[model samples]
Target chain A: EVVLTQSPGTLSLSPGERATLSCRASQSISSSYLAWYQQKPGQAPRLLIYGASSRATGIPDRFSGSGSGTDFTLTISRLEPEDFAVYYCQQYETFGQGTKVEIKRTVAAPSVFIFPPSDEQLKSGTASVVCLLNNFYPREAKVQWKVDNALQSGNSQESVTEQDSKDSTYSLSSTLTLSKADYEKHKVYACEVTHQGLSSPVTKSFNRGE
Target chain B: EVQLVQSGAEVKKPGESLKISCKGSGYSFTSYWIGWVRQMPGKGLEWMGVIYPGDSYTRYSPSFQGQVTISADKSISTAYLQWSSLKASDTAMYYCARMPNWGSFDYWGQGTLVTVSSASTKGPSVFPLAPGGTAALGCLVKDYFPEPVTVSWNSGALTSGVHTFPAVLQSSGLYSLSSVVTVPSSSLGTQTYICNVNHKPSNTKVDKKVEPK
Candidate 1:
């Protein structure tokens, strides 16, 4: 059987906070074989959810599990003092990597970098612009690109948000590729970052050929 | 196969202190970085930080920066996570895992639990010996409370050919560290080496003589 891997690795929050944990299996498996566990220090792990979305016996309503086949999520509505611990998802005997919801303090804004393909590189036909968001917290942010003020879709790609171990924040990148015609006409290219922690979206603008 | 085995469980007080350990085996300990993961009672995993034992290069998650310390000892192939003071919220299970260059956990140690209550206790442990014709000397310190200890090699006579590994936390909430110095066979018995451990738990400084055994 293929193994499962979890993302973000850790959740940092105190009581009353909400958290969503993910479990991704390498291959599809019946929901009947999937289960979630809660492990506190010095105690044995306890079952939280079983059969995918079904709550394990006596599990609180605040704790819910959902998803099926190869992707799963375990959500905590509100964290209680007792809720500060490690959680894991298991299928049959194989276990998903564990995730920990810790005490949260403050979240930070992102510092962005933009890398646009040079005019010479665009000569081959398509030109791409890359925007990177680094040094941010809570992992609740996204990046978007605007061409002369309009949201341009169908020509953009984004990467999964990843945590930076150094500061416990996150980093992600988005790429917007355009046809040579659109690339030449658009004088202003902008990368916009939106985050729950910030009052306003942060935007960085660049000019064509520069 | 790289295997990381962590220490047992621990019970402490909210205002007290705690330290936990993870020991690696069956691999080149200094070659790979080791990281720590945390899980609350019924929560998901949080990766704290990772340390390259070879050079003590370390990185912490912003969430964990300045809140905790991550260190390793290449001599014993061990990594540690420690807190100067405990919080009721600090009660949780921790695991140490081997990180590939790409930063994913391929092998994990069994979890070590730390419970913060109202009671706690304290202590200290060091060493060096010769391996083959070259002298391999090591000093290990253990079981000190709170933290912020200073470990140094005394006299400066054996300063050359010496490299000190980072300190590690034991399950008992104590801190331990190891250092090594190598000398040619001719100087093994002629030189006297001393290791000094300055522990704050009891306001005491202790020293040990290291020699070829």
Candidate 2:
């Protein structure tokens, strides 16, 4: 079966708030074939639901699951302090990408940095701009690219998002690749990051000659 | 030389006791470790446990600890996966693989399929046909239940220059795999070649020869 992919990548909410997570299988799966798990920082994943909607032993009623076929949902009626953790879904043994739940708090917007390209990059007519998003919560931030003020297409070459275990925060690195000719044009390249915790999108610009 | 040959498919009910076997050959079974892997229908692989047949040292994944047992008898060059009481959830494919010094499963047995159900499927039709050319040999195993087979090769003592390609998913949800090996000019005359395909769910192996030019 194809890998299970999850959505809403991150959920930032407070206690008493409702949260719903989604999991989708590439192929149609039986209702009895799906399972859900909760993984706290530095802890083994705990089975939450099995056979799609059946709650595991000793799990509180506040957490419930439903759906079948190719789609499934896990809903938490009200979040508790302990409910802030990463949630994952599995069909048999294939696991979905994880979804992290974080308590709503004032998290510092990620500090951004962009590194210049190397000699090998210039040889290939491609210059790489590495954008680092550090010290953010919820881990739901995204990186976008703009040349001056116009949005750039096919700008992201590679991107990676990681969760910091010690602080339960997140950091991301997105590499933007552009033509070396564009750099020679003195165009302004910007890495714009969008995060749930930030009131405004964080923008960092780089200039070729700078 | 190391080889792991596993047993066939099984159909059983819940709460039943069962034991399956994997017999090693061509190598000292007691000298290496054997591990068991599980693949539920349409799911990814899971490592259950491992056992060193020589001294019977065992280690289990915490998830599978106490859920099942892994044992080996060096006397017969075989390892076994057993359950005192099986659950419907236990219906899946199991494989026994040779754990080499590097800790990777370099050699594996054809899987053992255990179905705790009233209805079950049959094994795949495995064909280890001749070489596609001088450099590549292709084996096709089709119409199998619960895919993702382990495909490997055996060329006697000539193992230094061989490569096996990844399995390709066919339209029918079955898997197809091909491999290639650089044949030294000296061993080109009628030397035997074997394609070993391990499909755990249906519990089968296909070992066939390639005729040399």
Candidate 3:
């Protein structure tokens, strides 16, 4: 089975800009039996090109396929607002990791705030802290929870990105469960937010009993 | 050289007690751990838990902790899976395996099928005859308790032109089925067809080979 790797992990561009995605196979394919697909959240993937270069029926002419064997390309003549999702290349039985095309941002940085455990949460014996990364653009951001500045690699419940219809921005959230001892031993708990909208990482800290 | 031999199939009623065993041989049974897996018909394999025979210690999967019991008897070099009261949903094929230290299942036992019922089918015994020719091949599967059997033909490689008819119910309770596949005489002499049969319900296959005429 062929292993395909898509290039440019992410493509950040605005509407009307041209986009070119690439898929490189680990070895030369015996034939040009390759295909490309487009997928969006909440919808089934749509085949856009097959036989390496032939556009599928009903696909717009702006989407084109090219190349063969080890390297294949999919180019869009002009990026339409609705065309910025994920693109994938398929060969025989393997698929590329996918290239996500998202709109470049010009919006203000998101507000990073940590909500302390509530009375109900404490009463349930599972004290929690939730960090909200709200009103960010381009749908990509990272939130890191820390114990006295030490980043945690353990489990944290990160939520799906939700778009605010009223503002067209994205909101993401993460929850950290502090063990009964974590609250007393750790000097401080912090939520760090990093995104293209922020020049540097922003940290919000919470002290025990405050 | 480690081996785990499990018990045979059992048919039981809902709410009945049961215990199955896996006997270890060819190695120190107490030095390694034994685990059990379950696979219901048409479903996937699920790991239940592990028991160290030497110390009789256990690490029950969170989901199985309060549900079932796992035990070991080092005196007889055996491990066991037990159920206080079986549910209709407990019907499944179970596997007993050996794991070294924290490693994955290294050696496995032949499965033990437990059917908790008031329900369902059986398997078939298959026989193949080709006239030793490339022109046609026939497969006869008899004594299966259920319906259709899957039959495929291959001459070194898979070939087409197979015709299967409905199963014939025997005078007793079992059913028998026959399937034939056509081949081009051009590929004759030394070249012959072989038939493969799969009977889902009964879970048995044909005996040794039968030389073609």
Candidate 4:
């Protein structure tokens, strides 16, 4: 078995800056068994290169692999904003110790959490269903409201996306206003959020009291 | 266009000298590095070592150091792994790989099996090589060692163009011999012809039969 060690624990670079990662083997490896992966926090690592230099499916040409013997290199020609993440090299069962490429000053991939309507709003005969996403860089998200698995258009819908100068991270609040009569017609109201760093879109649903 | 085609399997007696080979093709064989990996029966993989066929520079693993020799012939673009005296513990499947710069294997040979044992000494295997015509009525007698085997026909026998070639050595350290007998198609009809192989070392006689289609 050949052991692999990745170099440069962290790389700080801005978008459009090139990214280069290295993986050194304990000894010479002689098969087309080396591969590279990209992983954002909370997401499964994606295969970018395989068989040393061959690009994996759907991988752009900007990502390439080169070098051989004890020294192997993984290069990204122009790092995209989404490309700021950790990279890993694999040789069959043995894997390299991962190298992280940050956005010079990077925030981890963002997440979304849904907020159910409040009791006071329900008492007021109107409730606002919220899809809140925060701590994300580059300001990105898509939100939708669902009624009993079907697409629903609330009486009034609003979306507010903002960035904090203090944290340099962005947040999004998309709300769907529903009347009590609307909630009675639609027994269940759900919110779906698609955001960066999420493998699958997230969802939150609430039901009227029995 | 890189390729690494390895030599065939081998069965050898303990303490016997043997060398197996892999021929690299379709690329600049000399400029790249080649390495060998070993896997004993039901065991893990072991990195034996690597060599530069152009310069013949080699680096062996400490566990395999001094136990085996790694060499290459740039003229033929071939790499070799040899043992002066094999041990039963050395019996395993050996793989040859090209270390294309990244220190990783890019292409690999389809494994060569080396079985070393005192019990490896065995009888010859006989088979019909061809039966097209009188001139091509041939048999291949092979795999016997210890220099003790003979070929005969248990037939209405003895026809012309009777030629028996001398035993040729295989890379496995065993022997193979080819024998041909001219039998006129005029004598077909269910009369079976048998090629008898006798290995005195193994005290066994193996027979191969050829009949009209």
Candidate 5:
């Protein structure tokens, strides 16, 4: 049977923040089409992302997605009040039983951090924001960034800080540059942090300095 | 824009029967279609079947094609999702959702959880989609009949909420789910409901709900 494994059973996301969920298919599902479902308690699972980044019919415009091939991600840039509970990913056109998904890891943890700090614009300049690990639980966590609800391009590898002998938390951060003209008037600019825990991913938004 | 408001929760004992109603309002109930859906305990949503309230034209999923009878009454602007001879495993939270809408759920009713144990006589009602009507409404079902006995609604006298149980001697041993709802002529547009049935012991359920705008 084709196996699909999702990290974390449940997660909590704050509104306007970014959240990411990972779905890893056993074996090579490189060609398989991925879809995501948002299932609240005691209700039917509503289709969120279909055909990878493309949104399904009637879904809110605020919900967006990206990533393809074996690595995939579903992002809700500006989290809505109702965007809580569970999220899942499954593959269509595959003969095997589909997979169930959930939230597990993100970069920002222990302490809340901001990217570009709201209203800080990147105009033809390079900017980087760091999420201090300072002191976080668990060991194997992953970190990444998001742009406008999708993964950022040409991002630097996460700079990891060794666990402080005094405390046991891993630290990491990522950065990206934006053209001045492109940052202004652009809709839904955001930064995401991925971890390995059952918590939801963290995303921070940055707008034009105006 | 169509809507579906379902009845409230229902409690019943094993072997007892139940029926629920999904009334449509705000649109021409007779002109469009309606459907039903089922959501079992800790499970996803499943489609049952659909019916054209105007002519009583019904369609079921292949898995549930011969498992239930889907009927509607265009006079009252309502649809139904029903079951008979309850079992312990039948306990679940059921919802009636509308489709062919403009991307929004449009009309969805609060769920009704049915517990199939000795408690009350009220089983559950048949909840159907709004069936091609202009009334943007949802169906809400609640437990009726105070006694611990099954309450039978006359398929003909029930004014569009019940249907005679269909016997399928040729098919499998499973009995079919049926409902007859009445839609008023003043309604407009199309609607749908989802129906999902699980035979005891087997967590798997059949789905058949109409998909129309």
Candidate 6:
């Protein structure tokens, strides 16, 4: 059977960090093809990324994607508490039934994770903090910075250095910096990363100091 | 409005099980059910199972109960009908049944092909009938294509060659894969003669016990 298998379980990520998941078609998918989606509990799935690295019709630019062949991903640069959900990928060429961008985890059981700094909290001079991404897959990742829940005005850090990697596991990260004043009114900041292979974005957030 | 329009037609053979599916387009997948149907090459429709999108709550038809498995992904709002074993008689087109309104069968999937051939049959001979019961069985099949023609038995187990029959096909391009077997009244009283259809993600078995009637 031409089967599509998912890494059964949730793909967990800390706030403001990156996450990577894989969707290998039983058969090889075409070039610059395939689509990804996100499904939070109780809600319908939404198209996040398509054509490997392109955003869907109305998807936000902050949510980016990349990778090719069977090894693909969908990254969310900033991890918002509401962004947690199951993600999946599918080949438009073989679009039919049972095409699930299967993920291991989506609705988490309220576990503890590291948070990132808010954009408003990243004001200049003052001890502002910005949450950053730690690890991810597919190499390429997208990042978004949030200040007091509103999208901040600034260039989101895209490419960063790779963290220490284990056997087959490696790390990808992104960072943002702002003034303390710019960071005011914002107690929480988020980092969301989107990758080609992940079912959903691996995210981590950081709140104002302490 | 939530809807699922499935692909149409495929062909496969015996011994090579296959899986077919229906994907949703516009709906909250987690809140509804996806179902499967079989209308033998010349028979009426048979209900395979209903799957709840997220956690795989699948209910199969006793006639098709165990022969295959029906699964769904709430995230994708899709339904799956899989088979592990393929029989020459397993050939037929399959479809994914979607219901826009939960609790009722309303939506429909576009038909697809599922043709099974003997050369495609893979692995050792899978047991088609339940143990010590009348031999009435079906196999779950998955191949690159759909197989409409399926096999059934009159008595004995697989490979008996004593009695094998082709599933009846209906005008609506469906597969009516069923078999009838008569067992000794004494055996029928104590044993449940099963006519199971095979399926995948592992075997999904359904049973029909013959009681004294």
Q: Rate the local accuracy (lDDT) of all candidates.
A: 0.69, 0.68, 0.70, 0.68, 0.48, 0.46
Q: What TM-score does candidate 5 reach?
A: 0.40
Where model 4 places Cα greater than 4 Å from the true spot, the runs are: A1-210, B120-213
Best by TM-score: 3
Task: Tell how far residue A37 is off in model 5, in angstroms.
Answer: 6.3
lDDT of 3 at A182: 64
lDDT of 1 by residue, A20-137 (tens): 9999999998876677778765454566777777775577999988888899998999988778677878764356777867656568876665655544436667665666665567
lDDT of 4 by residue, A31-82 (tens): 3777787766434345677778998657899999987788899999998877
- Give the share of true interchain contacts found in each model: 0.03, 0.00, 0.00, 0.02, 0.02, 0.00
Q: Give the range of the ten consecutive residues with the poorest summed lDDT in model 2 chain B.
A: B128-137
Q: What global local distance difference test value does model 2 have?
A: 0.68
Name the candidate that leads on lDDT.
3
For candidate 2, the per-residue lDDT at B23 reads 97
User: TM-score of B chain for each model?
Assistant: 0.55, 0.56, 0.61, 0.57, 0.48, 0.51
TM-score of candidate 3 against the unseen true structure: 0.47
Residue-wise C-alpha lDDT for candidate 6, range B1-213, written one tens digit per residue? 556666555555456667776888766677667767664443323446677776677776556767888777556556778899877566555656553232334345656656654343222112222112232222211121122333343233623312222332223233223222334335544554434444322233333332221
TM-score of each: 0.33, 0.37, 0.47, 0.35, 0.40, 0.29
Enumerate the candidates' DockQ scores in order: 0.02, 0.02, 0.01, 0.01, 0.02, 0.01
Give the Cα error of residue B2 in candidate 5, in Å. 4.8
Model 5 stretches astray by more than 4 angstroms: A1-39, A42-60, A65-74, A87-210, B28-32, B62-66, B101-106, B119-213
Model 1 Cα shift for residue B160 (angstroms)? 29
Candidate 5 local lDDT, residue A131: 32
Model 2, residue A139: what's the lDDT? Answer: 58
Model 5, position A145, has a per-residue lDDT of 55
